[PDB]
Amino acid sequence: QGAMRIALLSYRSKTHCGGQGVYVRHLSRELAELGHDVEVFSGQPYPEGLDPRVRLTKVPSLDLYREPDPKTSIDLEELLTTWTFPEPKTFSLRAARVLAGRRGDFDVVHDNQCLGTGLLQIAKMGFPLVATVHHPITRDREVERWYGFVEMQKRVARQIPELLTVSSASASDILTDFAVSPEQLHVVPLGVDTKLFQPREGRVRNRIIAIALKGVSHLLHAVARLRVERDVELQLVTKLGPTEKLIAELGISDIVHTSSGLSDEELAALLASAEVACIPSLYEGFSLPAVEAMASGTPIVASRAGALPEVVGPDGECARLVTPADVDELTAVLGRLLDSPRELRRLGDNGRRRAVEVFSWQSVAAQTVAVYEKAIARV
């Protein structure tokens, strides 16, 4: 009962990454809105828009992977400066030093996919420990920084009784790789601000939107072929001559408009102004654009790639599912959906309901508190 004291740990918290910062920013605000007191412990990159009701404690580390630059006065033995990726291992160690000073000041210690050895020391100090695993890094597809730290993560997550993952696709890939118990896992997805992301009663005719491997090339041929029959327009949200010179080759530089660095408000207006959102294999473990499109009442055309059929409702409810590499299938389903005015409304109404029913940040925060209480009950 009362305001729970929660320590939210995140070794990295980039403002725009789906996990790390966005997860930390939205979860902290909603936990504080529920009435609990949240204190976030973060390292570089430090978070940005945290709620004033949320306190931030900087855990400094040598950010040798800084964007401007890739030193004799290093103060801690945790500083490894090993060119032989120790940041998750070192963050959990430095967090154990701060957690020892506040042994009775926190009810739960929640981890944001750090999974370091120092977290096991925090649980040894009496802290109930919960860890959120967004994406199992055991997927060393690029093998065909160095992923030696993931061997430490699987040994830690296997001993944290309450584990949080965002989708069943990430849960199954954790069962296969991390060898974690199934009871150990609690699937709680990511949410969206259903107040900010909502229909706005004005949709431009024949306007598609896509937010960003990335199958954007397949969508670019779709809008290129759709131009002859329809006044199609693509609002592409990504930062980009680069590889996307397809815009020049297809002559679609006029109907394709690129935006980047948009705030959540600017994105919500654009995402609600479009008649359809396309998610072509845009799977970073969890599709925040799909949730943000459903919340806006915008029907989706997505690929059958991982958690997209799970996040998006069944085929024919919130979206139409297509085969990823198939350019022509994507082109036929888009045009047939764009030529149907009754289907754009039905899928959009069902997408708003599901977003409100399933993917609201408040519900995500409420389900997280439930996982918190399970770790408290075992202490």
Name the 3-class secondary structure at 109. strand
Q: Which residues contact 226 (CB under 8 A, 6 or more apart)?
A: 232, 331, 334, 335, 338
Strand order in the sheet with 129-133: 54-58, 37-42, 5-10, 108-112, 129-133, 162-165, 185-187
**Cα 312–323–231 angle (5° rounding)?**
80
> What's the domain range around 163?
5-191+360-377
Measure the CA–CA gap between 333 and 340, rounded to whole angstroms.
Answer: 11
> How is residue 191 written in tokens?
């949410």
85 with 12, same domain: the answer is yes
Measured N-to-C along each axis, helices 87-100 and 150-157 cross at an angle, to the nearest 10 degrees, of 40
Reported for 244-250, long-range contacts at CB under 8 A and 24+ positions apart, including other chains, are 244/216, 244/220, 246/217, 246/220, 246/221, 247/220, 250/220, 250/221, 250/224
* 198 assigned to some structural domain: no
What domain count does the chain have?
2
* 199 assigned to some structural domain: no
177 with 274, same domain: the answer is no
176 with 315, same domain: the answer is no
252 with 174, same domain: the answer is no
* 68 assigned to some structural domain: yes
Instruction: Tell me how crowded residue 339 is: count the other CB atoms within 10 A of its CB.
Output: 12
> How is residue 181 written in tokens?
């118990």
81 with 221, same domain: the answer is no
CATH of the domain at 310: 3.40.50.2000
264 with 315, same domain: the answer is yes
**Cα 308–313–318 angle (5° rounding)?**
105
27 with 152, same domain: the answer is yes
Measure the CA–CA gap between 240 and 24, rounded to whole angstroms.
Answer: 26
Q: What is the largest CA-CA distance in the chain?
A: 67
The answer to whether the CB of 190 falls within 8 A of the CB of 363 is no
* 67 assigned to some structural domain: yes
103 with 221, same domain: the answer is no
* 201 assigned to some structural domain: no
Task: Quickly list H helices, 35-116.
Answer: 87-100
Q: Which residues contact 199 (CB under 8 A, 6 or more apart)?
A: 272, 296, 297, 298, 348, 352
**Cα 209–311–338 angle (5° rounding)?**
35
Q: Resolution for this model in angstroms, one decimal place?
A: 2.8
Strands 300-303, 319-322: pairing is parallel
Name the 3-class secondary structure at 360. strand
Whose CA is closest to 180, among 197, 201, 156, 199?
A: 156
319 with 373, same domain: the answer is no
